Design a protein around this ligand. Structure first.
Ligand code: ZN
Ligand code: ZN
Ligand code: ZN
Ligand code: ZN
Length: 158
């Protein structure tokens, strides 16, 4: 007897199919609730939460830890890369020298005084803060997240 698809209720006669969430699927029937991507082709897993079945990217977007830019105040989505300094997060284009306005990039030396950033050549001696810091590589805003909602997809031959 063929298996029935959890997405459409039809018998699955296809040579290749999917298993995920304890169910069988026509690959075309296992789709992201948000973006309609065919989960079994785009990646190796789905996420279940709040009645939805999501791709990784939409799971991050909808449920990942968003932040806010200390410079401009505006929210940052979990998917965006950010610069970090002194426990704050910044949009890449917000991560600038307060004096000359140069954008700071990984490996740069810089100074931080009360939320103000200064490049190596604008050490704010009058304000001084004297600690030289090194700009780190950007990281994702949402950071690492657990896999509690992740459900791997298995590609099967019938
Ligand atoms: Zn189906
Ligand atoms: Zn999606
Ligand atoms: Zn910003
Ligand atoms: Zn500068």
């Amino acid at each position: 007897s063929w298996k029935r698809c959890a997405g459409c209720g039809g018998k699955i006669a296809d040579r290749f199919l999917l298993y995920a969430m304890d169910s069988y699927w026509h690959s075309r029937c296992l789709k992201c609730s948000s973006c309609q991507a065919q989960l079994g082709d785009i990646g190796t897993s789905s996420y279940t939460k709040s009645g939805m079945i999501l791709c990784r990217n939409d799971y991050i977007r909808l449920f990942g830890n968003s932040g806010a830019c200390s410079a401009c105040g505006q929210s940052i989505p979990a998917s965006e890369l950010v610069m970090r300094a002194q426990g704050n997060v910044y949009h890449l284009k917000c991560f600038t020298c307060s004096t000359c306005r140069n954008r700071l990039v990984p490996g740069d030396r810089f100074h931080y005084i009360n939320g103000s950033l200064f490049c190596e050549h604008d050490r704010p001696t009058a304000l001084i803060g004297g600690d030289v810091m090194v700009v780190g590589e950007p990281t994702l805003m949402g950071g690492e997240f657990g896999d509690e909602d992740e459900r791997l997809i298995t590609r099967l031959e019938n």
